[PDB]
Amino acid sequence: MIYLSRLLIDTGGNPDRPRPGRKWLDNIYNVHRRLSMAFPSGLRREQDPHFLKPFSPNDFQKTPFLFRVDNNIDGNDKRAIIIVQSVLEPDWDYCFQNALDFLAAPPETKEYNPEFKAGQLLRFRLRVNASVRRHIPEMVQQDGQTIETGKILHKRVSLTWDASSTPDQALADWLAAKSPKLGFTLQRCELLQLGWVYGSKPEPKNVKVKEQGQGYWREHKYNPLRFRAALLEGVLEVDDPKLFLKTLSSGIGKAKSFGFGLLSVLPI
Amino acid sequence: PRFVIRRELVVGEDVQVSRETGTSVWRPKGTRADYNNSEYKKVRAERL
C-alpha cells in the first residue's frame, strides 16, 4: 500500500518573464515544505476551502514520505518530474489550488503494491546521501592561523575515496557494505551524478523582549544547509524479502527529508 | 444725561497688535509615511 505519485513541474522557457517553478526548485527546503503542505488532516481542509490562511505547521499530518526530483524523456520532450512515495493519500488538490503556475500538468496517484520474493533480478535507480561521520574530526581551522580553535567537532562531512580510486566503484562497495543488512546485491552499479545540493532554514531566534509580553520583538536568522549527493542505478538481486519491503517503505539514506532515500524498483 | 467726549488712538503707537493663538482650520489627518523607521523595520520582522 504505497502511493507512487508524480509531478510535472512547469519550468521556464523565457529568462525575461518570472519563472516561479525554477526558483522554487532552486531551494530544497521550500520543495520539502511545499511537498509536506499537501497533507491537511481535518482542520485546514474543512475550515478553509481555498487555502487563504496563515501557515501553521502543526495543522498538517506528520506522515513520513520520500521524494526525488529528476528529469525524463518520454516521446518528444524533456520533463522535470518529482516522484513522491508516501503511505497516506496525497491531497494534490489542496496543494496547488492557488499556485497552479508551478505545475505543468495535473498530478497522478497510482497505487504501488509489489509482492516481491527473493532470487529474482530487479533493476533500480536511487539518489543517496554520501556523508560519513569521522571518528577523528579535524579541528575548526581558524582561517587566520588554520590550526585549531577547539579540538573535536563530530560532524557529518563527506565520503572520501582515497586518491586514485574510482568514484563509481567506491560508491558501489560502500552501498554493498550495507546491502546484506538491507537485503540486496549489486553487480553493475554505476554513478551518474555526484555533486551538492543546497538549502536554507529560517530557525527563528530572539533578540529583544516586549514591553508587556513575551519576546515578540524576535526576528528570523538563517541557517544554510549543504548535502553531498550521489545518483546511482543498476540491477539488484533480492534476498530475504521481509527486509526489502522495510527498505522500500523507509528508504536508504540519512537525509530522507531532503530528497535522498527513495528507491524505485522495476521488474527485469 | 451726561457729557461724553470722543477721541482717537493710533494702533501700534498706542496699542500693540497682539498675536493670534495656535489655531488652524480643521483638516482631516493625512497621516504620514516612513519605512526607514526602525520600529516598522522590526514590526515587519515580527510579521515575517
Q: Are A183 and A252 in contact (CB under 8 A)?
A: no
Q: Would you call B45 and A216 a contact, using CB atoms and an 8 Å cutoff?
A: no
Query: What one-character-per-residue DSSP string does A214-227 give?
Result: SSTT-----EEEEE
Expt. technique: cryo-EM
Q: Which three cell numbers stand for residue A189?
A: 552499479
Region at A40 (left for phi over 0; alpha for psi -120 to 50; beta for the rest): beta
C-alpha distance from residue A151 to each of A136, A138, A140, A147, B2 (Å): 10, 7, 7, 10, 113
Q: Are A215 and A261 in contact (CB under 8 A)?
A: no
Beta-sheet pairing, A108-112 with A184-186 = unpaired
Beta-sheet pairing, A223-238 with A190-201 = antiparallel
C-alpha distance from residue A95 to each of A20, A34, A46, A250 (Å): 15, 8, 14, 24
Q: List B residues 5-44 in contact with A (Cβ-Cβ < 8 A).
A: 42
Other beta carbons within 10 Å of A3: 16
- Rounded Cα distance between A45 and A38, Å, is 10
Other beta carbons within 10 Å of A203: 9
Q: Are A206 and A218 in contact (CB under 8 A)?
A: yes
Q: Would you call A217 and B46 a contact, using CB atoms and an 8 Å cutoff?
A: yes
CB contact A162 to B (< 8 Å) = no
- Rounded Cα distance between B23 and B21, Å, is 6
Buried b (16+ CB within 10 A) or exposed e, A173-200: ebbeeebeebbbebeebebeeeeebebe
Residue of A219, A220, A221 to mutate when probing chain B, most B C-beta within 10 A: A219
Stated in angstroms to one decimal place, the resolution of this structure is 3.4
Spell out the residues 6+ positions from residue A81 whose beta carbon is closer than 8 angstroms to its own.
Answer: A6, A7, A8, A9, A69, A70, A71, A72
Other beta carbons within 10 Å of A94: 18
Q: Are A266 and A152 in contact (CB under 8 A)?
A: no
Q: Are A7 and A84 in contact (CB under 8 A)?
A: yes
Q: Are A173 and A196 in contact (CB under 8 A)?
A: no
Q: Are A251 and A257 in contact (CB under 8 A)?
A: no
Q: Strand pairing partners for A71?
A: A80
Place of cell 499537501: A38
Q: Provide the angle, in degrees to the nearest 10, between the axes of the packed helices A241-250 and A167-182.
A: 120
CB contact A218 to B (< 8 Å) = yes
In 3D space, the residue among A176, A219, A192, A201 whose CA is nearest the CA of residue A258 turns out to be A201
3-state secondary structure of A40: strand
Q: Would you call A220 and B48 a contact, using CB atoms and an 8 Å cutoff?
A: yes
- Rounded Cα distance between A205 and A91, Å, is 32
